[PDB]
């Protein structure tokens, strides 16, 4: 049985490879060869947020893209008013090692988690005026790597236990558990329609998942590294990946293969975060070399660099209106670029 | 600036005051990472430091300096990712069962992976070779012999500079010093001086383990001061 099943699996893998190759009518670099270059993009630090004590592990924007949550290993979440640089809330955590945080799209809740293996959902709109734990979603047998709200009642999570999970916040129970990657799941990004989401793991693969029931509709399998960062193209038909082989790769969910590889010989450092601009021409990637690079998502050329950080760029995110790029780093500062 | 904006600024400044009050605590507490296989007595050290959750913050105090000790108790075998969080810790407390010779090679490879990690390269390792009582019983009884697992034990002499405690049987001393030598050999290669290993023979019953960590952290902070204050 076992060897017959392995032969069947290898033949199916070769079939998938053949289909993807058959779909390779042309490369993105060929089709985009005629399009005008983006030119240099000299973004400047408009704000620097000085609140955190320790390394800033993660950040997320509000949908009314003015407020901004950020997490650090000192056990604080700070809700930032990017325009005024004011601190809206400072949330003491019960676990110091928070590795991810999220802002609910309604702006009512903020989730965070880490080595505690607990997704703590915080209610920002309490009548008491304090910020309070609504749920301590527990169930992962490993550290939480990413959390993203689908709505005030559904939060998807990724964990080092190799499995992603969709949670009913009111019930405090996993609505669906997504059959594991081979390794630790490190990044998630919800599709704009919120029906699909894509996950990257420490195995060199990214898996497209259907939220309605946990089937990995597609697995993307080009990388020589662990996928630290993942982000959907704004229309949801493609998603970018980042990994410690110092390459970002753009995958198409309809051609089921990598369109473009963003790589330059001078970049030996791994990639920690990835985000697109609103139009999709700019792919912003954070690197261990303390820099963030702006890539022409179509031409693959580097459009510019955000150079203000003095330690590993840890997290970055583009406002829903595209006005600004936030970048957190282990230097304990968030710098907003525009 | 409107009245509500001024009040928001006042709230921000009152958050900053609290953040400074917490920064004092953050700077005044020494973080420690406790690693070791399930065979290691790290749990017994945690329990005797009596001054599905993936992290177990243990807090203790010696000579008026506060130690936070972190055990990652409920996480998967691989660590190349979550170990990155623990740079900027004072030390890594690595506990290894010195008695179970079958697991010693696995412990040695784990110590290598910890020592040579890209992020930990600046972090010292406090190495508790635990369960020395069991090692004494085992090597005295002769039912299992280290030579069968490490062939070089047949050609290893007790270092002439060693300082065995009273009552030390020569074979016990030789075995424990050979294990220590293996770990120290892993430590000295690729050390580059930026981080150093502090081997200790200990039993999980020993109350002095807190003093060992205190002294080793004092030395680690002393080296960090040497570099920070430009003495070296």
């Amino acid at each position, epitope marked *: 049985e076992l060897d017959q099943l392995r032969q069947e699996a290898e033949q199916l893998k070769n079939q998938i490879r053949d289909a993807r190759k058959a779909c390779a009518d042309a490369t993105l670099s060929q089709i985009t060869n005629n399009i005008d270059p983006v030119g240099r993009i000299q973004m400047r630090t408009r704000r620097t947020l000085r609140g955190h004590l320790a390394k800033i592990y993660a950040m997320h924007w509000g949908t009314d893209s*003015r*407020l901004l949550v950020s997490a650090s290993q000192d056990g604080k979440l700070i809700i930032w*008013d990017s325009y*005024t640089t*004011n601190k*809206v*809330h400072a949330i003491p955590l019960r676990s110091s090692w928070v590795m991810t945080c999220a802002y609910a799209p309604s*702006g009512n809740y903020v989730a965070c988690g880490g080595l505690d293996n607990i997704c703590s959902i915080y209610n920002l*709109k309490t*009548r*008491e*005026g*304090n910020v309070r734990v609504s749920r301590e979603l527990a169930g992962h047998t490993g550290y939480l790597s990413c959390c993203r709200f689908l709505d005030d009642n559904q939060i998807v999570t990724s964990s080092g236990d190799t499995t992603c999970a969709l949670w009913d916040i009111e019930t405090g129970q996993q609505t669906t558990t997504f059959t594991g990657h081979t390794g630790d799941v490190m990044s998630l990004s919800l599709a704009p329609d919120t029906r699909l989401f894509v996950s990257g793991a420490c195995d060199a693969s990214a898996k497209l998942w259907d939220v309605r029931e946990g089937m990995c509709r597609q697995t993307f399998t080009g990388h020589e590294s662990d996928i630290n960062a993942i982000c959907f193209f704004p229309n949801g038909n493609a998603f970018a990946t980042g990994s410690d082989d110092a390459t970002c790769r753009l995958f198409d969910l309809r051609a089921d293969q990598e369109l473009m590889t963003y790589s330059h010989d001078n970049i030996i450092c791994g990639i920690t975060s990835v985000s697109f601009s609103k139009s999709g021409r700019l792919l912003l990637a954070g690197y261990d070399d303390f820099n963030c690079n702006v890539w022409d998502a179509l031409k693959a050329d580097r459009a510019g660099v955000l150079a203000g950080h003095d330690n590993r760029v840890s997290c970055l995110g583009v406002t829903d209106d595209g006005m600004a790029v936030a970048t957190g780093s282990w230097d304990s500062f968030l710098k907003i670029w525009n | 600036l*409107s*009245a*509500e*904006d*001024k*009040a*928001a600024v*006042e*709230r921000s*400044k*009152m958050i900053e*005051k609290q953040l400074q009050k917490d920064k004092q605590v953050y700077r005044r507490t020494l973080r420690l990472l406790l690693l070791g296989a399930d065979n290691s007595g790290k749990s017994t050290i945690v329990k005797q430091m009596r001054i599905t959750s993936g992290i177990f913050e243990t807090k203790f105090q010696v000579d008026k300096v506060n130690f936070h000790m972190f055990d990652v108790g409920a996480q998967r075998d691989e660590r190349r990712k979550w170990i990155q969080c623990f740079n900027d810790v004072t030390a890594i407390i690595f506990v290894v069962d010195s008695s179970d010779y079958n697991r010693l090679q696995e412990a040695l490879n784990d110590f290598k992976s910890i020592w040579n990690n890209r992020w930990l390269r600046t972090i010292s390792v406090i190495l508790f070779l635990n369960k020395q009582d069991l090692l004494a019983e085992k090597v005295l009884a002769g039912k299992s012999k280290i030579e069968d697992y490490f062939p070089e034990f047949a050609r290893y002499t007790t270092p002439e500079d060693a300082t065995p405690e009273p009552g030390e049987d020569p074979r016990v001393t030789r075995a424990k010093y050979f294990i220590r030598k293996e770990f120290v050999d892993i430590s000295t290669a690729s050390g580059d001086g930026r981080h150093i290993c502090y081997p200790h023979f200990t039993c999980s019953v020993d109350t002095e383990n807190a003093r060992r960590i205190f002294n080793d952290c004092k030395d680690i902070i002393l080296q960090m001061n040497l570099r920070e204050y430009n003495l070296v």
Partner: single-chain antibody
Amino acid sequence: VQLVESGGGLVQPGGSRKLSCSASGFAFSSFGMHWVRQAPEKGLEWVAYISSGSGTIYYADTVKGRFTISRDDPKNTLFLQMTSLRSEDTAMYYCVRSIYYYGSSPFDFWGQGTTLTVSSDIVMTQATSSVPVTPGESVSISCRSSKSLLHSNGNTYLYWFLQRPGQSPQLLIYRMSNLASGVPDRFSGSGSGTAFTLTISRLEAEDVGVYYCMQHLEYPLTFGAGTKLEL
């Protein structure tokens, strides 16, 4: 969440009296707190302010010097020590909480109040003292200000309050268009930089009462005379 004021009673003119308010069920320390008076059978009038952490204190020019506002956060108590009380100081005194951050709703809770019996700023004009209406109708209460409440940051600092008979005022709309928690969508705010309008889109028996406008642009906080709705 509660705010129980205490300290009212008869005071001879020129005397001194200390009001108090026992806060419970919310993070007292985080909230700035206000005292607002209501002269018997008249409109609201702002008295004093003390921010979170007591870093900022404001008083109405009518009470500067006579009144001092203080808070005891560990005891969750707000104090208003009154001295040289005039006859004009006779009013029911409401303790009012407010919290200030982006998207906060100041003045969202008012205590039940305590009665004290004795013996250049922006002025808000409400066009009508009373309006007769029956349930199911739509009512557009209107307001106007002597200075544009639309600040450069885009906020129009107009607040709306409904005081039902025998109750303390309840916040309806905090910025001219933002609807408070627990308020039905029937209430709908609107306005320009200088003229404002509160539309009660489908009146109910619970809506009868006096509707007060308030400005939060400059500090002497000035309430309107109040538009009464009568069944």
